[PDB]
Design a protein around this ligand. Sequence first.
Ligand SMILES: [Ca+2]
Ligand SMILES: [Ca+2]
Length: 314
Amino acid sequence: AELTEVRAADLAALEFFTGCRPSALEPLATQLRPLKAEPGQVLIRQGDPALTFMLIESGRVQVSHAVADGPPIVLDLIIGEIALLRDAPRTATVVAAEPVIGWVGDRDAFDTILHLPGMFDRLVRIARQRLAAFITPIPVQVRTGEWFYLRPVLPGDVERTLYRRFQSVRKPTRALLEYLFEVDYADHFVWVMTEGALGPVIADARFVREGHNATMAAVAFTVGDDYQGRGIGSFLMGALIVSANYVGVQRFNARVLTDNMAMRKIMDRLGAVWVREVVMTEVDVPPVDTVPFEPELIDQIRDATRKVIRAVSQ
Ligand SMILES: [Ca+2]
Ligand SMILES: [Ca+2]
């Protein structure tokens, strides 16, 4: 009875929960368990089913990946939630590098957090800060001569937004799925182009698989009103082609309003025979041999592609 209330108060003292009233945390406190881990203790084990996530109050952890052809790949607030939510087995071991204090919850407790005021966006900022370490923006020069920066979308980028793959989560809520959507790279890959390495997004492009691992994918493109006709579209399409090739996608398709000529031109470059409703097309995914980028720039795009996909456990 009372110990749930000490728990709520303890939760409310996390900066993660700043601004929450303790009384609001009591049902969550019911569903969480305290974690006290010793240095060296395994928190999450590669090859386990994912049964919980952890919310860390203090102490560093270290992630490693064990393989069959050499030593474990090491690296270094929320842990284990993505495989929890996908119901995918753990692809990595997480060990305590210090004493680790925090709390353990199951998928329902994670859903409880997602539905608390302000907490969806905080959780997403946390996924975002974590993915940022796996992303190094690539300066790229478009046909105009201007320099811009290319990078995968990050969780939280507005350009992320825009029921067919997620039919593999049991008894989901919208929040669970929207959260998974923010950390999806394999079935939904989005390249983004920004002004400066840490500046605003000025265009994006995406393929969305038809369903989980489908060979066909729907593509879309967008270019800020100040950046029309600079070759930004055809460039992103280049990266988009490098990424599709890498993950298995062999065909693209596109549905467009007829007056949206700029999109249409992007597709026309690919052998688009448009068929009315307002218009649509379907085309093959040209070989990586074929993208008008130096072999060096190809490698970096594939490298960025692999990096984020692995960081998100696909
Ligand atoms: Ca970044
Ligand atoms: Ca499930």
